[PDB]
Structure 1
Amino acid sequence: PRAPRTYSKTYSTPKRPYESSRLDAELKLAGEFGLKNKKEIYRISFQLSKIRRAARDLLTRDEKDPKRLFEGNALIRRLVRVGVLSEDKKKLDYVLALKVEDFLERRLQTQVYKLGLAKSVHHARVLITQRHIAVGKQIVNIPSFMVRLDSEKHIDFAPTSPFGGARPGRVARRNAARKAEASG
């Protein structure tokens, strides 16, 4: 006996497994954004479906309804924060009309790619997994990170890593040691 931990799954498999159009779109997204799984796209579609369900439940109501005002302004703020929704679009209909790519463009992987530092989304993914960036001066090794539009300026290489400095690295040290012992 103890209070149970709560858990939820974050993705939903599509009903039709083999739909060439959907497969093509999914693989195009995966190639454009450097993904290993359709599960990532399913997860983003799941989040977007929840957001859209909420927005529909609110839009069915009256405007000046306190629940609508409160929760809709909160949703809009929470999306404008991550930049999934522009500050030009704050009317709760563009929320419904957003996209999957609007979310998928805010991942730290493609955001690294945009802010130089990787010259490829796959290079960015491996750089993240290999600890060679810091969002503030905090290290992250997760591509799915959803930058908040204020950390975008603070993204940079990590101090305790090569490309930020203070040590070359394992293979470089081995090569320099081979070179130095050969110098003898």
Structure 2
Amino acid sequence: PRAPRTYSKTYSTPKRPYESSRLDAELKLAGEFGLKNKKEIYRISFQLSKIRRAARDLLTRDEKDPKRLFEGNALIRRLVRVGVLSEDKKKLDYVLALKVEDFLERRLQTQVYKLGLAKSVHHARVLITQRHIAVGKQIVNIPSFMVRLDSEKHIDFAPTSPFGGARPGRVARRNAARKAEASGE
């Protein structure tokens, strides 16, 4: 038979369910950034967990070990590109100081709010899912899309929508027609 397709699980569940102090901290993030699930938080903390595991491992290696040089530089370079880590803090020891809010701040859903365009993080989510936002030429409709530092110049309304320059939507057209027809009465 054909070779197996590989797949993997992307989140982890907190090991004590009813730790009351934790429940409060999670709900503030969801209200601040307009998330729909706790899973959206678990996903981020799962990624952050693995980054620390790798970084902490490398720090056992001596400086000028060729592996620490090669892979350590890759990891730092890759986080700077998305803007999670400042290019001032461009050193491996600072990777251990990142926290969840550093990643949520970079989601397309929040960037479309900080730029204007929308007027709440709840309004921003609606526009993305309804296909009004484009990055460069490509229409994007996923809220969790991580905006790389180059792309921020190119976020704007899509060419093929109202707000972007196309024809009015289905409901505006219906209203104009009935009123025009009645105005002929």
* TM superposition score category, shorter chain reference: over 0.9
- Displacement after TM superposition at 1:103 (Å): 0.3
Q: Which stretch of structure 1 is more off in the superposition, 150-159 or 62-71? A: 62-71
Which structure carries more helix by proportion?
2
Q: Which stretch of structure 1 is more off in the superposition, 41-50 or 59-68? A: 59-68
- CA offsets 1:105-160 (integer angstroms, 9 cap, x no match): 00000010101011111111110000010011111110111100100111111111
Identity percentage of aligned residues = 100
Q: Does residue 106 of the first structure (1) align with residue 86 of the second (2)?
A: no
- Give distance in 2, aligned partners of 1:69 and 1:175: 65
- Displacement after TM superposition at 1:180 (Å): 1.2
Correspondence 1:1-184 to 2 at 5 A: 1-184=1-184
Q: Which stretch of structure 1 is more off in the superposition, 149-158 or 65-74? A: 65-74
Listed as ranges, the gaps of 5+ residues in structure 1 are none
Higher Cα Rg, which structure: 2
- CA offsets 1:150-182 (integer angstroms, 9 cap, x no match): 001111111111111121111111111121111
- Displacement after TM superposition at 1:94 (Å): 1.4
- Give distance in 2, aligned partners of 1:75 and 1:150: 19
What RMSD, in angstroms, separates the aligned Cα atoms of the two structures? 0.8
- Give distance in 2, aligned partners of 1:128 and 1:65: 46
| 3-state DSSP of counterpart to 1:156 | strand
- Displacement after TM superposition at 1:4 (Å): 1.0
Q: Which stretch of structure 1 is more off in the superposition, 173-182 or 129-138? A: 173-182
- Give distance in 2, aligned partners of 1:164 and 1:85: 33
| 3-state DSSP of counterpart to 2:87 | coil
- CA offsets 1:61-82 (integer angstroms, 9 cap, x no match): 1111111111111111111110
What is the number of equivalent residue pairs in this alignment? 184
Which structure carries more strand by proportion?
2
| 3-state DSSP of counterpart to 2:156 | coil
- Give distance in 2, aligned partners of 1:132 and 1:34: 18
- Give distance in 2, aligned partners of 1:143 and 1:95: 25
Listed as ranges, the gaps of 5+ residues in structure 2 are none
